[PDB]
Design a protein around this nucleic acid. Sequence first.
RNA 1: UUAAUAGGGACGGUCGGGGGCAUCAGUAUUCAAUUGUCAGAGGUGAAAUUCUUGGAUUUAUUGAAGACUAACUACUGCGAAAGCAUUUGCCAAGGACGUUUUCAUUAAUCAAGAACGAAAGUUAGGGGAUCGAAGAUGAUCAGAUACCGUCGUAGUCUUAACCAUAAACUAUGCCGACUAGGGAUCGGGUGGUGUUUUUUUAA
Lengths: 54, 708, 127, 237, 25
Amino acid sequence: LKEDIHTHMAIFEQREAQAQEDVQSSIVDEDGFTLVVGKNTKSLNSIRKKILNK
Amino acid sequence: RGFSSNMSHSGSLGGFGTFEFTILMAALLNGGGINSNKILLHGFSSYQLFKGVIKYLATMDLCHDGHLQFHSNPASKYIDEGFQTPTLFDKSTKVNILTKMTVSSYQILKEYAGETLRMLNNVVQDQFSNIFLTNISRFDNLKYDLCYDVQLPLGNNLETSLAATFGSMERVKFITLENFLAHKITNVARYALGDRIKYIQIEMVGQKSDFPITKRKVYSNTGGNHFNFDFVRVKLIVNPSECDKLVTKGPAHSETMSTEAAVFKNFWGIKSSLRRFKDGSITHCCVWSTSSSEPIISSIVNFALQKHVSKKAQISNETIKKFHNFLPLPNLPSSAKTSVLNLSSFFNLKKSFDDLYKIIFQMKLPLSVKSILPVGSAFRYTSLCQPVPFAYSDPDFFQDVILEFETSPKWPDEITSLEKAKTAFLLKIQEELSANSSTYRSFFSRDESIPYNLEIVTLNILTPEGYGFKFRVLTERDEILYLRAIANARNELKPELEATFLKFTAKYLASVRHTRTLENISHSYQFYSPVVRLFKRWLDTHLLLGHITDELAELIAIKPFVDPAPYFIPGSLENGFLKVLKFISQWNWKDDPLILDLVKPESERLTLAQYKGIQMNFTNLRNSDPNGTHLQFFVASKNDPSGILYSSGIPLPIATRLTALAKVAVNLLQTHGLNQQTINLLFTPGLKDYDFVVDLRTPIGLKSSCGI
Amino acid sequence: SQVFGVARIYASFNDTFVHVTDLSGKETIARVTGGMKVKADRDESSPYAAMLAAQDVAAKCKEVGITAVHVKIRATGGTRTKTPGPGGQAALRALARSGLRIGRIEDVTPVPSDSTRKKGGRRGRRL
Amino acid sequence: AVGKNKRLSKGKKGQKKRVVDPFTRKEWFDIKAPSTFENRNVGKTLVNKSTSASDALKGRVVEVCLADLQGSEDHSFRKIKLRVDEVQGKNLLTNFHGMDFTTDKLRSMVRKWQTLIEANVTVKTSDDYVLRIFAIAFTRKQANQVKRHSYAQSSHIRAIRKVISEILTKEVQGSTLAQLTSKLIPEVINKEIENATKDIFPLQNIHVRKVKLLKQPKFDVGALMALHGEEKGKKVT
Amino acid sequence: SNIFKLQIDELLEQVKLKQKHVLKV
RNA sequence: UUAAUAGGGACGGUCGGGGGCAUCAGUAUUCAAUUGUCAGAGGUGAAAUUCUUGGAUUUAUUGAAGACUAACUACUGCGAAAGCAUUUGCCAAGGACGUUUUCAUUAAUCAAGAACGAAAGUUAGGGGAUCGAAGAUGAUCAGAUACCGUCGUAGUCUUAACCAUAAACUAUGCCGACUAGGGAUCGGGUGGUGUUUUUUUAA
């Protein structure tokens, strides 16, 4: 169990870290539209879900 | 309520008929108050006329302190003085109509009037059917907690001693020996039991009132023109608070033995003793010994009745004995002597938990522990077998405990990551627990109760005292992730995901509330603890616990107590259990919802707005599910307003089987009275209607490791 | 083996009350003041009155059986001074001098969040 | 003034004599605390012997510091009131009756150049024990703050007061008093307030100032015995 | 209250004795 | 024709111990019930009226009444001024900021008159805990403690109207320009930044 948990947390932290950088990296569309990302946002997948939810 | 105008000094409950009801109408329509003011006005409707008298009988006392006088031929006046017997005097005619009322029956009458007045004032729930369209007199056991049948000796005439005891002095006072013996039995039984009981009724079984014209007096087969009865039955309403008291307190010691002390020593004889207590008081007292098979009352009534009425009488209540034996006897010291109302076994479990409860807090963790909430069955006094040290074959040995740490924003937002963080907590809890406290043993286990949630891991702690505890994390993020789970699911899969959420809250969120309320309410209902196990034991014999969650049985078993109407709150194992079976027999779960106020006896009571909300839920559910295939039992309360939490997922065949056995059980009691043969028939499974039956035998006997 | 009391001292500007009780408080064990122990009223607030007052209860304290006391010192309070006067501390000294085991010391002077007008008036008092 | 020169006062004629030492009749009685506290021994008390003793014993309230009951100086500044409810064999069973802090700690807490926020709520627990809670918090400056004071605007004080009130109401409603007291001892409640108020503002020294029990339901000896975790006497041979 | 009143009236008419059996007695 | 770093109004998020009507808390004072004990309690520079063995003062469990918001309280905030410090809701009102929205000179000064106007005072009801002009009474010994003590009317609070006076002070008409630097604070706005924060409920 110790090894299984340790591997799983490490993989998650890398993916979570990468996701947070992607959203807060000044995303700009090919037509020069700069996506607005709020502070504390971590995943772009979450942003899409809000647009769908609302 | 089984009330008639017939004689009651003979023993039958009655004397109060229409005439005593209607005559009391006129007295109150002509006055009735302590100021001779009218209590009933002649313009009152049928409801108002009936209400005041149900109120009148309930609160004004007509037997011991106070009596009412009226004029048939003059305003009726309530006098404070009492004649020590029920009296509604009539000065115009100089007759007391309430002469036929026995002292014992009057309090029973007053109890019914008061408890109906409470339902009459009730506005949340309709009580029309209970007050009027429910017969509580069909079974004595359902109506009365304990029943003892006494066989008098030489029964073609009573023994010379017993006939001598009646004597010349009592013919004038009591015209018939049947009347005299009933008063003798009531006085000694009432005096012997004292505060242990609320009401006592003595009934002459097999008493006839009609005889052929060819004969002068009624003839009983046992009587032989001497005594018009077969046998007497002592029926009791026991008081749970002091029913199992080991000692019967008596008058205090003094220089000169007082009259109360005189009757105290004479009545119990050798059984009486003068004994001192820790407080330093010296009083005359007598001793009893508790037993796991019988109550203290059976011992008192036997000894008291034999000494005073007849040394040759035979007292036997085997029916209550069988139910006590069917309750498992734990493997603890002095188990046989322990009473069925004792919860010492559960308390020792709590103290062991308290020791571990301290160790966990002082331990240092990355997140501070918010609270630890025990939620196991034994913590709410409901486990089928009482906890036993090291008896780990009991399936209820490992008690669920909910641990919740302080709110943090660092929880994984992925649920499989969320739990692997949860397990990482318990892993650390295991490590320092092993180091600092080596006397405690621990191991991990997986849980699959929540469907599809295959990562849950729980720590099972084996305490040095010999008890097991199972620990699982609660997280604030966990709930909303499930709410996130339902939202993203495809429309076809959403009904499946909400079912997963339903069992999650059943185990984690609502489980905490269920134990908190039940533990507190159980104290007031002393006999709830014994009955609920025996009901669960009954379910297990018929193979129903496997589909019935433990909570549903508990909510079913508590209905006769929070809602005892038209009956009284049970104070016996046999009375409480049969009432549960009766309710199931007459419960129409397709059209009638089951909703309870989990409150102590007269806040958190359901008021009208919350009440109406719950039926509105039932109607909406039944609109979509009229046949009830998806859901059968609608059990709701303050804790569960949805009403589907603890009754979801049961197959329809099991639901009908539960009601089927109850009706046949009631029909069995109707056809054949309560006895040893019936009780065994109730508690044994048919196993024939099942299409195929598979027999298993374990390699070793599991009783001794189960604590039985 | 250690039975506890509560030694309550009320140090007013004109008098000092030394009152020893049980833990809960209704039962008085011993109550003496400076007026008990002095011949002139002007010296009731004097520390000398407090000590001979405090010593008297301590002997009476050992009589009933109480061997330790929790000290709850206070002043007159209200719209008057908040701090116990020299008499209060002197009594606390004597209780230590008597030998009684002192458990805890707390100030329970009544502090008003809002006080009615003082006796002095606008121009003041204590001239 | 016991002086001779002191003038006689009116009361001095009628003087009842000390012909009875009161303690000759008084009987000592032992007090016990609920199982929630580690140290059940909280001393003893005395009453006149029964002619009864119990009637005076019921309603007895004793106030005691946690440090004695918990055996830790971390709670030296907190006190609990325990009310006697049942007596058996000279052992006085008590129940939680109140909580409060020492005056010195409250005075030391209130300091200049900061804002004092206090919130109170009237709420009942699941056992129908109606109670009133008082909570206090204080503003604090950040690590890099250069402003002397850490005042918060009125809208912010109201926002904090709304958050704190919600938490206190939630904790009391979804718990029993015995469970409620179990949370008071570790001071867990303060930790959720400071995290609940965390995104709003940094607060320091968050504490539940006082607990009052406004009403009580019908007394239940059965419940009382359970919280404390019957006895035969001795035959006179 | 109106529900209870109508429930009384329904209860009565169920238990009212049939007038024909009166005339017979 | 401009759209005055004239002005009006709008609209957006804030901001305030601004105002009124309800509502909640809070100790403290006095009084009352119960509870344990006993000789003084009170007050002064020192004492005496006064209360007290029907139990004073003091101890605790409460309850009732009327005022009023300590500590947090700062060369800080709001209001034309006088003034305004507990929580929550309702009613409207207002300064500043933002505006690539709107009128187009609608402005400055000023008589009579009007509104507000601390505390005290007045008419007629209510309330009356505390404080308290007046009046009563104790003591009238000693100069740093030399005017104190007890009872206490009107008043202190409020309702509907009068009275319109303050060292109601920048001891200092109003409107509008220009004529030095410096950094503390309050409200708003703009940019940057990394700590505290935090996550698909919202905010």
